[PDB]
Design a protein around this ligand. Structure first.
Ligand SMILES: Nc1ncnc2c1ncn2[C@@H]1O[C@H](COP(=O)(O)OP(=O)(O)OP(=O)(O)OP(=O)(O)OP(=O)(O)OC[C@H]2O[C@@H](n3cnc4c(N)ncnc43)[C@H](O)[C@@H]2O)[C@@H](O)[C@H]1O
Ligand SMILES: [Mg+2]
Ligand SMILES: [Zn+2]
Length: 217
């Protein structure tokens, strides 16, 4: 149960990751969350990633590989893991292959959550996120029970700094450029599985369960 999620901005990685963690009991590793936390604490890593994140650009490969290697060396990952948003370039995928061969934990599947770019701006412009637990809502497609508050913990919802329309536009263009190379890389490895992410959330998850419930230790 060593899984990677890939998708264009707003395609649903975090929403599906939360459901995967709850059903299969593996830890969630999100590079976006790691960088935004370091930004928040203003660590040197934080301050250095911020210039890229704010513009909607990729943080450089070397630093991102490093935080992922460190995270994967923790003991929770022995049973599996769900990488979310990493790799997102070919060079990050090649490093991860090498790390995971050294660790003895090769990827079982890379799940690509496919959504038309033309749907993604509306997903991100309506996204409202819990300041406490990070879960995401959408004003129309997945609202909280009470506006402005998270259902789980009563935390204040906020708008991610990079979800402004002109940032979303750059994020889409930056990540669309990596898409073909990365799908070729993992299809040629025979670990890529695509899912149609333009369905109701529970229907996307049903397809994820066909894939992950088919794995056996
Ligand atoms: N490896 C790496 N290398 C270098 N730089 C890196 C890096 N990783 C990260 N970075 C940097 O960090 C930045 C942020 O990375 P990251 O945090 O990974 O952002 P991302 O990849 O753009 O993905 P998002 O979190 O925006 O979208 P999501 O697909 O998780 O959508 P969600 O489930 O929330 O859902 C979106 C919205 O839609 C709603 N929704 C979800 N599913 C559905 C559905 N099926 N139908 C309708 N609405 C839906 C939700 O409620 C929500 O409102 C990057 O831009 C880069 O600068
Ligand atoms: Mg996310
Ligand atoms: Zn919350």
């Amino acid at each position: 149960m060593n899984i990677v999620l890939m998708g264009l901005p707003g395609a649903g990685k975090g929403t599906q990751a939360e459901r995967i963690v709850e059903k299969y009991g593996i830890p969630h590793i999100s590079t976006g969350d790691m960088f935004r936390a370091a930004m928040k604490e203003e660590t040197p890593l934080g301050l250095e990633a911020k210039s890229y994140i704010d513009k909607g650009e990729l943080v450089p490969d070397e630093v991102t590989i490093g935080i992922v290697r460190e995270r994967l060396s923790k003991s929770d990952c022995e049973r599996g893991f769900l990488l979310d948003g990493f790799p997102r370039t070919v060079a990050q995928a090649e490093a991860l292959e090498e790390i995971l061969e050294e660790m003895g934990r090769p990827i079982d599947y890379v799940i690509n959550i496919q959504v038309d770019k033309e749907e993604l701006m509306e997903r991100l412009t309506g996204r409202r996120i819990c300041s406490v637990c990070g879960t995401t809502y959408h004003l129309v497609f997945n609202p909280p029970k009470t506006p402005g508050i998270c259902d789980k913990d009563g935390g204040e919802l906020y708008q991610r700094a990079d979800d402004n329309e002109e940032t979303v536009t750059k994020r889409l263009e930056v990540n669309m450029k990596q898409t073909a190379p990365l799908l070729a890389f993992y299809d040629s490895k025979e670990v890529l599985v695509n899912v149609n992410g333009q369905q109701d959330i529970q229907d996307v998850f049903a397809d994820v369960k066909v894939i992950l419930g088919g794995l056996k230790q």
